[PDB]
Symmetry: C5
Subunit: 168 residues, 5 copies
Amino acid sequence: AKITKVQVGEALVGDGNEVAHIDLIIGPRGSPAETAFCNGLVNNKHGFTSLLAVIAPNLPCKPNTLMFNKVTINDARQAVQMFGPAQHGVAMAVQDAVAEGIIPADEADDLYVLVGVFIHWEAADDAKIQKYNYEATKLSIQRAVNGEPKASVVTEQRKSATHPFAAN
Amino acid sequence: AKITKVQVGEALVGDGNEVAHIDLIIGPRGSPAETAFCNGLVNNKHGFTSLLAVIAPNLPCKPNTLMFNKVTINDARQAVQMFGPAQHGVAMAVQDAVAEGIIPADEADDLYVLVGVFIHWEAADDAKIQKYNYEATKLSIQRAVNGEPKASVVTEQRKSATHPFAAN
Amino acid sequence: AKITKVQVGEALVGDGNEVAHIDLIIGPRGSPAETAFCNGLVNNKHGFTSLLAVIAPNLPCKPNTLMFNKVTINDARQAVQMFGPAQHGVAMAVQDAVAEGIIPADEADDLYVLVGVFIHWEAADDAKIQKYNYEATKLSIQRAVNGEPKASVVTEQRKSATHPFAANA
Amino acid sequence: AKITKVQVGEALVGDGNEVAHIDLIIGPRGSPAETAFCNGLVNNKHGFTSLLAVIAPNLPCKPNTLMFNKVTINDARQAVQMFGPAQHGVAMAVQDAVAEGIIPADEADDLYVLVGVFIHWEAADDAKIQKYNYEATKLSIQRAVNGEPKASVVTEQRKSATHPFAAN
Amino acid sequence: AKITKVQVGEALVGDGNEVAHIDLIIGPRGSPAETAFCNGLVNNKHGFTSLLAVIAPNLPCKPNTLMFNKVTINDARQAVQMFGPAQHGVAMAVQDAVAEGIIPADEADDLYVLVGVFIHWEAADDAKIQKYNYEATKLSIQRAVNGEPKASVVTEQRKSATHPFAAN
């Protein structure tokens, strides 16, 4: 056991225009994570195509991971960022999580990961896109895998948190 | 116990261009709310991107909450309102509902909330956007959690209700 | 008991540019009607936003009802018609059906209704939009709740029906 | 019952610009055909609206049938073709199938049919659109109901088939 | 007994503008592969229409296969490539896999295949599109059916793989 149900993770890492913000879901075979993984892959639309995360072509990360963008992709520059530095970052994060035991190795062939990726339209430095997404994805997985933050923990610190875009 | 099935809530709070109108769904692990939560997160389209509600980046509200817009988002101003004052409002409403016992604390880690939010394209006051959405979301949760309004109650007062845009 | 599975209803009522045509689904908790209700509410697109049908803000009809448009909504005029006269009509039809026992009162809190609404882009009379949709929605519910028209009934009268846009027949 | 599981049918009938090509799914209550029927009806997008197939308004065909277009519908001419001659043709094909026993009469009230229809943007003859779609839909139903063509049959004749758009 | 759960395959084959890259899912009746197959066929949008893979019209490959594009289809040239050389290639790959026993013949009538295909907008040689997609689809099926690459294998070689658009 360990990851026996759907868990949701999230994390924002970085700064500048390359800042990464990952919204993530992970779950086992037979769970809604598997259903959304399949429903997600077959459904592409203009500006939003979902693809399997791969460390490189012919080397997908395992557990199977589906990546989808949040910001509308209007040109090749945006498409390559999403499926170049960000994809490699997300995929390496997933595989490093397995290597480090965060995602148990003996569960990796029966889990599905869904990763929502943020790339501001002014992002420019590939190295940062790749690093921040690697870090945000890894943090999201670590959190999701432990069901964190627990509701009691969020309740306790809700009043001290600061949302960047809050009216205040 | 208490929230053992899918419940739907709704509420309109506020006035002017910042008026809030929330269409909401809440349900437990294993229910259609969990399925729609996962199917919803992976599917973004131009003008409509769905994201996890967070009190602030790195502090999502629990229960896991998915937010989606009703009015087409054409620019950054609209995007920030939806995912700034409204998001903070929605997320705080969810966490305050947990703190206040409306959503039992011992159920918060196994529930999913889906929140449709309205922001007129002429909305301008962030403070109101945030406050009205916080209030509308809280009201919708309170209602949904009690399965209100009950059908018998709606039937009794259907003839005296006034829809602002109705012909008659 | 009564509405124990997914049922589909349809009806065209009215004339002129305000003519209503409703494509409807109703089903209980645990059925695909509930799944489509949830999957439908969270998924909005340009020109197509789905909302809960309400008699008025703060007074949604019960059973829970999801409304979706068939004709692309390009401006506020169209949006208000869909979620003004038509919404009020759809919602009242659902609530009147409960009041009249068409939808048993003791099942109303555990059912879901999905309503596809048609409003021609030249529709103009709000009173008609509201009335026709109320009438069409009510007819669709009554039909769906009884699983009508039954297949044997459609089979028997297929040759005499006349489609407004067919080549012939 | 005969049709206890999801079956897929397909058929191309006709020629010229009115040629019909149907991709079809049929299945019983409780199957993925019923789920896709419901998920399909509620989800309309620009250029693609799905509707119940009806022999005529106020007379839908039974089994319940959902129709969806393959070619983007940009104007009223295309919309009326799809939901006029083709709709009537599709709906009559379903009803004639029931009348002829291809779809058992005692199963017709508990089945769902999903019909993808093709109408080239240069199609012009309503009579042909109606006839070809009626014929293609009926052939697809007949094939689907028997699970044909069986895999062994396709395997045997794969080398002699000719795709009109293949390189060879 | 061979293919009892959902498996995911992927492969990139070829070069130049016709290079093929397949993201594939295969699964049995009753699995999320069947659900996504049905939900996928009924849902078409501008630039993205999904169709059954056929060796030729009136001869679909079996197991039932749904094809969907990754690159927005803006004109007939792109549409024909996707549903001509690529479709024939994908469908023949599926049928050859059955003939060769990769997909057991006695399981072929109860399996569903989902194929995401890539065709760069500058692709021009139909013969290559067809051949590369045939080989990439066949490789993806072979991999998927064996649950390959296994997580342990990806972990072992993650550091030596090279992604074309990211790199590290």
